[PDB]
Amino acid sequence: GVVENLASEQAARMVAMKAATDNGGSLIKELQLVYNKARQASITQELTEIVSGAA
Amino acid sequence: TGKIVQVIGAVVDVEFPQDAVPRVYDALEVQNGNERLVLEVQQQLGGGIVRTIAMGSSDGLRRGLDVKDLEHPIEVPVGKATLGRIMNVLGEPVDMKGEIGEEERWAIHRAAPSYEELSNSQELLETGIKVIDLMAPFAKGGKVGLFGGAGVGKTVNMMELIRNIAIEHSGYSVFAGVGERTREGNDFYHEMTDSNVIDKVSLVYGQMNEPPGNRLRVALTGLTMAEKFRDEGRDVLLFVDNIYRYTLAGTEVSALLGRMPSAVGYQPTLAEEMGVLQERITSTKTGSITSVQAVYVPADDLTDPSPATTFAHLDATVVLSRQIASLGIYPAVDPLDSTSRQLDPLVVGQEHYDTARGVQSILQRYQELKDIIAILGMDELSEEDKLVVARARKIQRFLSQPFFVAEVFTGSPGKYVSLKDTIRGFKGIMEGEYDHLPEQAFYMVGSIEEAVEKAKKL
Amino acid sequence: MATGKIVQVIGAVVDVEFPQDAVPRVYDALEVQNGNERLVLEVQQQLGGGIVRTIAMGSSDGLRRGLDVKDLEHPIEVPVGKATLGRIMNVLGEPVDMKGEIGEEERWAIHRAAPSYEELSNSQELLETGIKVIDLMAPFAKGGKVGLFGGAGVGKTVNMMELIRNIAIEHSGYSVFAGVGERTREGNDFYHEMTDSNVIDKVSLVYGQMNEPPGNRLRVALTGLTMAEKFRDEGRDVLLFVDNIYRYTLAGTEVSALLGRMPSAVGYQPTLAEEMGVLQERITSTKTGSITSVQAVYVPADDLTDPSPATTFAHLDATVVLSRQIASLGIYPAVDPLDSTSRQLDPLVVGQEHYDTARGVQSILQRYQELKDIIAILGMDELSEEDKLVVARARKIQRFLSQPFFVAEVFTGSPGKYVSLKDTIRGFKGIMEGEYDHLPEQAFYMVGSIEEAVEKAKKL
Numbered sequence: 019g020v021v022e023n024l025a026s027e028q029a030a031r032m033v034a035m036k037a038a039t040d041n042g043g044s045l046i047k048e049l050q051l052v053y054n055k056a057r058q059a060s061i062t063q064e065l066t067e068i069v070s071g072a073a
Numbered sequence: 074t075g076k077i078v079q080v081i082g083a084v085v086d087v088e089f090p091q092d093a094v095p096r097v098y099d100a101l102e103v104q105n106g107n108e109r110l111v112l113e114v115q116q117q118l119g120g121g122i123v124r125t126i127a128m129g130s131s132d133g134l135r136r137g138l139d140v141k142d143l144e145h146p147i148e149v150p151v152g153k154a155t156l157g158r159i160m161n162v163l164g165e166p167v168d169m170k171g172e173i174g175e176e177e178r179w180a181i182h183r184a185a186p187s188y189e190e191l192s193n194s195q196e197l198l199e200t201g202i203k204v205i206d207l208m209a210p211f212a213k214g215g216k217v218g219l220f221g222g223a224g225v226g227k228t229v230n231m232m233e234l235i236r237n238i239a240i241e242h243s244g245y246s247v248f249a250g251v252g253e254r255t256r257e258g259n260d261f262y263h264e265m266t267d268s269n270v271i272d273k274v275s276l277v278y279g280q281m282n283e284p285p286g287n288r289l290r291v292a293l294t295g296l297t298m299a300e301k302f303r304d305e306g307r308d309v310l311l312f313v314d315n316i317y318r319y320t321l322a323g324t325e326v327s328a329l330l331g332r333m334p335s336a337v338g339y340q341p342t343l344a345e346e347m348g349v350l351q352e353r354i355t356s357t358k359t360g361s362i363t364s365v366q367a368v369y370v371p372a373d374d375l376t377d378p379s380p381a382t383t384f385a386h387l388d389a390t391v392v393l394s395r396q397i398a399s400l401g402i403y404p405a406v407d408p409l410d411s412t413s414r415q416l417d418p419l420v421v422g423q424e425h426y427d428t429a430r431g432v433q434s435i436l437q438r439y440q441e442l443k444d445i446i447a448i449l450g451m452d453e454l455s456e457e458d459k460l461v462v463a464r465a466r467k468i469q470r471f472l473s474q475p476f477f478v479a480e481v482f483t484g485s486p487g488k489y490v491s492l493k494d495t496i497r498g499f500k501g502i503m504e505g506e507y508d509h510l511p512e513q514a515f516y517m518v519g520s521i522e523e524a525v526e527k528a529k530k531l
Numbered sequence: 532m533a534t535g536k537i538v539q540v541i542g543a544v545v546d547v548e549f550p551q552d553a554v555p556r557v558y559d560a561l562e563v564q565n566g567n568e569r570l571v572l573e574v575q576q577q578l579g580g581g582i583v584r585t586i587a588m589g590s591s592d593g594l595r596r597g598l599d600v601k602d603l604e605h606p607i608e609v610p611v612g613k614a615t616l617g618r619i620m621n622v623l624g625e626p627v628d629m630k631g632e633i634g635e636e637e638r639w640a641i642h643r644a645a646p647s648y649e650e651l652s653n654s655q656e657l658l659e660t661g662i663k664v665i666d667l668m669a670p671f672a673k674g675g676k677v678g679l680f681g682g683a684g685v686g687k688t689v690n691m692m693e694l695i696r697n698i699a700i701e702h703s704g705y706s707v708f709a710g711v712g713e714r715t716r717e718g719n720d721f722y723h724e725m726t727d728s729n730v731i732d733k734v735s736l737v738y739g740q741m742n743e744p745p746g747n748r749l750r751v752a753l754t755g756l757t758m759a760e761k762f763r764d765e766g767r768d769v770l771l772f773v774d775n776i777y778r779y780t781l782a783g784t785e786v787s788a789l790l791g792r793m794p795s796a797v798g799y800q801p802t803l804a805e806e807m808g809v810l811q812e813r814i815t816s817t818k819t820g821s822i823t824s825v826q827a828v829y830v831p832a833d834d835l836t837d838p839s840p841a842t843t844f845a846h847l848d849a850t851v852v853l854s855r856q857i858a859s860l861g862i863y864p865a866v867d868p869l870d871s872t873s874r875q876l877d878p879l880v881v882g883q884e885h886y887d888t889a890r891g892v893q894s895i896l897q898r899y900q901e902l903k904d905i906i907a908i909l910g911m912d913e914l915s916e917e918d919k920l921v922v923a924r925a926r927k928i929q930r931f932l933s934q935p936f937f938v939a940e941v942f943t944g945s946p947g948k949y950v951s952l953k954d955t956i957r958g959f960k961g962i963m964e965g966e967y968d969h970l971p972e973q974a975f976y977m978v979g980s981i982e983e984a985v986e987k988a989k990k991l
């Protein structure tokens with residue numbers, strides 16, 4: 019019984035970590051959309067401050 | 074006696090003799106063809122020129138037209154005669170009934186009441202809404218503001234507050250529509266007229282179709298009537314439909330007035346233009362104004378300069394979020410951002426305060442776990458963090474409520490939940506006396522007995 | 532006679548018009564009587580005909596249009612030489628210590644050209660500072676530059692106080708301290724600490740305090756550099772302390788914004804890297820003498836990437852990074868041994884003994900960082916019999932890098948210590964090689980030299 023439970027622990031941790039890797043992968047794709055939006059907003063704000071400050 | 078010399082969009086430049094130049098905020102007049110256009114001067118440029126904003130459509134204005142200098146500011150009817158009638162920013166009647174029989178007219182630009190005259194009140198105001206008067210109770214004679222993005226519930230919530238506070242309240246009321254839909258103004262006018270409360274409400278409407286000057290000054294036109302009712306010794310309700318449009322209309326005109334842009338293209342005078350209005354909407358020793366203001370936040374950005382500068386002017390701030398509405402949880406109030414000046418052990422008693430802070434602590438602890446749950450799944454939580462999470466979700470459900478003004482949407486009948494009846498339900502959920510019920514037993518119910526009764530049907 | 536007149540005053544910026552023969556040159560210094568009090572202006576630009584735009588080196592309030600202005604025909608020039616030791620001076624070289632007139636014999640202009648690449652000499656004489664961790668992990672030569680990096684409250688200013696004291700007392704070297712954007716409380720603490728420790732008569736102090744216009748805070752670094760260069764030309768080895776580069780860059784940003792120049796990467800002036808190169812390139816070891824430099828540099832928001840620290844790095848020869856986490860555990864100096872670095876830490880210059888000791892220490896600590904989390908999850912009794920020894924020796928090495936300073940005695944009352952490099956290497960090598968496995972850890976804390984650890988263990 020102990021040994022079957024050990025093999026089952028391993029076979030369960032395997033699938034748990036597979037799911038966790040897929041969740042991390044699906045979370046990168048949202049963080050990167052947020053990041054690109056922030057990058058664009060920063061370029062726009064800086065360049066507008068410069069141009070519309072001059073003259 | 075003056076000539077137009079420029080017309081840029083909504084702002085008009087007029088030239089007067091050197092000895093006759095109008096004062097700031099005086100109102101001029103032009104015959105725009107088969108029309109009469111009122112201009113309100115904003116700046117005295119040099120050399121007899123004066124720069125003005127048109128209170129109407131600017132199209133069709135030639136250069137060189139002749140403008141007449143009315144020697145007084147914009148002045149609106151005010152008092153008891155203006156009650157149950159719809160008015161322009163200029164105080165003209167907009168419903169098809171006759172003239173307003175007003176006795177007296179007031180200029181819409183006024184100084185705020187002195188620091189000496191103010192008053193403070195601890196008297197709590199009760200509303201039928203669980204989340205509002207648990208997390209952010211507000212008091213008679215104080216300011217409330219509903220913050221939200223586009224389409225999250227800050228108009229439905231205001232109509233529910235109207236229903237729950239304004240019908241059961243004896244004094245007069247004032248509703249200023251500032252840059253919002255005309256459909257909603259007509260709907261509200263007919264609801265009031267069909268329930269025979271219209272004879273206690275005064276309506277000013279400067280909706281989104283109108284040009285910038287109307288949206289810019291309509292809020293002051295409404296405050297002037299609220300102030301007249303206040304000074305008569307009464308106590309008043311003032312509902313503002315969207316105060317953000319009042320600063321947006323200023324942003325639209327600022328650059329044409331020749332002023333350098335500030336942080337995100339906003340006028341440089343944003344905080345002053347906002348304070349000079351919100352400092353005169355207050356209660357005083359002679360009478361009190363209770364006000365609810367919807368406050369649009371652009372692009373859901375709560376740090377945009379306009380909401381950020383508005384936060385400081387309110388007693389109770391209710392913050393609505395899209396990520397809660399998308400779960401179907403209405404009203405979509407965010408209880409980790411709603412707050413009130415009135416939430417003190419001295420004001421609401423120890424039990425209310427303690428339950429509110431317990432709810433906040435559980436919901437924040439649940440926010441802290443949302444990333445580990447996202448990566449590693451829920452089975453990796455300690456045996457008691459799972460309990461925290463289950464109670465947090467039950468509380469999230471239980472803050473939902475059906476509204477009498479949302480039957481048109483969900484069909485379910487509205488519910489009115491008394492405060493005594495809600496702090497008990499939340500004490501119960503937190504202490505653990507309702508773990509047996511499923512989560513969906515709490516969704517869209519009134520008192521807690523309705524939840525235990527709903528569990529019987531799943 | 533006075534030959535110019537003010538025509539504008541907008542904040543700190545003053546415009547003066549001269550007849551088109553007498554237009555002052557750029558960086559010339561003007562003078563005007565702002566009431567009962569004199570005020571000097573530094574020319575920044577010649578624009579248009581006759582008119583000249585200037586930055587006021589003082590309070591701009593009280594200026595009228597049409598005041599007479601007299602143009603000194605030389606840049607801002609300051610007293611230099613032995614006469615300035617032990618005095619405090621502002622950017623204009625006036626005494627602000629109330630001990631009266633300076634007694635100068637000579638004055639130099641603060642604007643001058645950097646030494647040619649032809650005149651430099653490479654030298655590898657390592658400075659010996661007396662601080663264990665800085666000597667071991669971040670050695671720096673004469674004529675080099677050292678940057679103390681960190682947030683607020685980590686210890687840059689007291690580390691510089693200690694370096695000043697050690698160099699002045701153990702080596703009798705002259706020093707110059709340029710308080711760019713100084714906090715007056717810290718300037719008074721520094722003055723009283725240096726006079727109490729009896730080093731003041733070998734340090735000359737220049738203060739541009741925070742409550743002063745931008746031009747003062749910008750030109751104070753050049754005043755200090757000019758005094759250091761006067762000492763160098765005498766054939767000495769001076770050491771120049773700049774109390775914050777970050778405030779030099781902010782003063783430059785302010786000055787550039789006032790003059791209306793078009794801004795750059797994060798609101799920084801367009802000329803950032805050129806101001807930094809004008810400053811940093813006068814600090815060098817010529818064939819006649821040497822200027823070494825230690826420079827505190829605040830990193831705002833820990834990012835190491837905004838243009839100010841990003842542009843300073845190109846010039847430094849060694850970097851000491853201070854962390855508040857280490858400081859909160861109480862082990863001052865709070866230097867991080869794994870991130871601090873030096874271009875001079877290679878065997879050809881420090882010798883295989885020093886290089887080996889430094890890399891050994893880094894290796895032990897880098898391994899202890901591995902072991903920390905196994906100790907956390909599995910407990911220490913599961914470690915190997917070799918790993919438990921690595922843990923004990925890493926903890927002892929980590930204690931032994933702390934040291935009590937002579938200038939920190941006011942904070943803790945414990946007396947300070949000076950530790951040579953020979954004793955530093957001997958102690959760290961002994962620790963790493965097990966010669967002290969019999970002492971308890973706390974025998975190494977705030978101890979000083981290694982013999983004092985055995986003297987302390989007996990007391991425990």
Ligand SMILES: Nc1ncnc2c1ncn2[C@@H]1O[C@H](COP(=O)(O)OP(=O)(O)O)[C@@H](O)[C@H]1O
Binds near residue numbers: 230
């Ligand atoms: N209490 C509620 N119950 C059900 N649906 C609601 C409730 N409050 C708002 N909604 C939904 O949110 C939509 C947004 O409407 P509204 O509140 O007018 O947004 P806005 O605040 O921008 O006016 C409503 O039309 C309705 O669909």
Ligand SMILES: Nc1ncnc2c1ncn2[C@@H]1O[C@H](COP(=O)(O)OP(=O)(O)O)[C@@H](O)[C@H]1O
Binds near residue numbers: 682684690936943
């Ligand atoms: N070696 C030290 N011994 C005792 N206290 C110290 C030491 N280093 C720093 N401190 C404490 O840190 C505080 C500020 O250090 P300071 O060097 O001024 O920080 P910063 O680098 O931000 O200027 C001082 O008040 C002092 O009490």
Ligand SMILES: [Mg+2]
Binds near residue numbers: 227228253
């Ligand atoms: Mg709306």
Ligand SMILES: [Mg+2]
Binds near residue numbers: 774827
């Ligand atoms: Mg400092």
